[PDB]
Write a protein that binds this ligand. Structure first.
Ligand SMILES: Nc1ncnc2c1ncn2[C@@H]1O[C@H](COP(=O)(O)OP(=O)(O)O)[C@@H](O)[C@H]1O
Ligand SMILES: Nc1ncnc2c1ncn2[C@@H]1O[C@H](COP(=O)(O)OP(=O)(O)O)[C@@H](O)[C@H]1O
Lengths: 301, 283
């Protein structure tokens, strides 16, 4: 119950505009698209886009995950069982063992991969998805003709997503209700769609089909969903920088303080904060903007 | 490809022509070679050219594909005195497999080993010193990429204006693979408009739509330059730079600076690094 095409795909204007151009070209050229790479925080709709592309390209799609692959031959086998034009979608692609990753390079670039060698290749489209762009090797990303980084969603964009999704659940989510759920969804369709199913449940027990703002708030507060959508980690990060004065803190310190991986801070914890203008990456470390100070004060009132 | 109309790597080409001549002049195959440099600059291409010049077979493999002994022993046994063995990510080998390689390279069926690595400073002196020839591929000049792009464009049935090739060159971080990749994206913008001639206007539209940096910089390349520029040319050492960018030193010299040096954005001096005059002009 996710969008099936671009016809009414919400958000990612930039990615959509470009995919539309490359999709026209490939078809005009009577060929399949070059390899595509999607990167960005979980639940932003990259698995979705992958399947939309399969529909737009009237091509079949096969899915798998990096950890799911282990034996080098296994991958070689996967390639062997693909019809000319198909799409191969690998999620968490950044977790491929150098060995497997080494077998993939020639498959993408050339379409060919006792003693023995041989083995040609049908000619397909490899779509890779990662939530850890920083962990992706240059030899691998530089082989994707197309590279797209999903951005977070505006509250107005989530609103629409909720309104349409609500409809499929046989419910009318008023605008003001959509905006309030979005407000606590941390600009992420998955969280918002999750909260929607909870608000619905309150509507059901009250024999209601129209989710109002008032009832949305009832549900959200009753569940204790943070009013601003912050995680425990968002609060810890902002408190760490806000605790320090307008003096930048580098990963070395931050990572050390939050006893967390240095890469997890850049590609998982910070993306949302930077997106909503809570922090900035200065020339020598990070700093918290006015948003943070006023946001935190507001959260603890 | 075979050196005839080869673009770039002037010095490597110059030196290889001499060694290939001397080698053949004495009916022998080249000694072991080591190609060093960031990904996508042309190590594999050069290896193939050598295979053609020496008119010999070439077998490709990588360190991670050689797990434990049995793997390596099998590859060498299936060689043929004069053949060429190309091993990628060679600095990724274990001391055990690395130990089994030292002898074969020196003791031996005379063959030629070509090692490739993107981390020269990551490779050990003992192994490095056993490759008769050592070459550090260098980044390409705008004009060189432009010409390369124009040639690829022809194969893609399209004429690429000089200004259009340079623009792409500029944002392709002086790297053939990136350049080529961006060319195909621009080809698409051309197709949609029924254009056979890739113009600068169309190029910008594409590069900008995709959000490719104007100078092909990373988030790192910018902080690094902001760090050095702010220093008003008072030399800074690695230790300081390593801390400020929360980055490992080898990555700075081995992966980040190489490109910045090549395009004259920074300078290496006895007392440290400084932002060049060229970086004070552009923003
Ligand atoms: N742009 C979008 N428009 C509508 N729904 C979206 C959009 N992006 C994501 N979603 C929804 O959010 C959920 C998570 O999407 P998914 O593609 O699984 O994200 P990811 O692949 O990043 O984990 C899905 O139910 C999907 O329908
Ligand atoms: N000197 C060159 N002239 C034209 N194209 C080049 C040149 N060097 C590299 N390329 C192109 O860039 C890509 C990188 O080739 P490769 O040798 O695999 O780079 P590396 O092995 O260093 O990653 C290839 O598609 C190749 O066509």
């Amino acid at each position: 119950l996710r969008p099936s095409n671009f016809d009414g795909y919400i958000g990612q204007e930039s990615i959509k505009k470009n995919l539309n151009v490359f999709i026209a070209a490939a078809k005009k050229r009577n060929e399949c698209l070059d390899h595509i790479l999607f990167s960005g925080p979980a639940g932003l709709g990259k698995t979705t886009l992958a399947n939309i592309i399969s529909y737009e390209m009237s091509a079949n799609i096969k899915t798998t995950a990096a950890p799911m692959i282990e034996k080098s031959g296994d991958l070689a086998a996967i390639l062997t069982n693909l019809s000319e034009g198909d799409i191969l979608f690998i999620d968490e692609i950044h977790r491929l063992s150098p060995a497997i990753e080494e077998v993939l390079y020639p498959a993408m670039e050339d379409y060919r991969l006792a003693q023995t060698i041989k083995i040609d290749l049908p000619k397909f489209t490899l779509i890779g998805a990662t939530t850890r762009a920083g962990m992706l090797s240059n030899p691998l990303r530089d082989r994707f003709g197309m590279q797209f980084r999903l951005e977070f969603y505006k509250d107005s964009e989530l609103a629409l997503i909720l309104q349409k999704a609500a409809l499929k659940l046989n419910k009318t989510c008023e605008e003001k209700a959509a905006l309030e759920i979005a407000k606590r969804s941390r600009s992420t369709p998955r969280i918002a769609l999750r909260l929607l199913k909870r608000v619905r449940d309150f509507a059901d027990v009250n024999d209601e089909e129209i989710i109002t703002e008032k009832r949305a708030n009832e549900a959200l507060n009753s569940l204790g969903v943070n009013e601003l959508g912050f995680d425990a980690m968002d609060l810890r990060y902002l408190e760490l920088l806000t605790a320090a004065k307008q003096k930048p803190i580098g990963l070395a310190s931050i990572a050390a303080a939050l006893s967390e991986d240095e890469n997890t801070i850049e590609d998982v914890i910070e993306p949302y904060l930077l997106a909503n203008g809570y922090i900035e990456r200065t020339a020598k470390g990070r700093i918290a903007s006015a948003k943070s100070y006023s946001a935190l004060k507001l959260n603890y009132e």
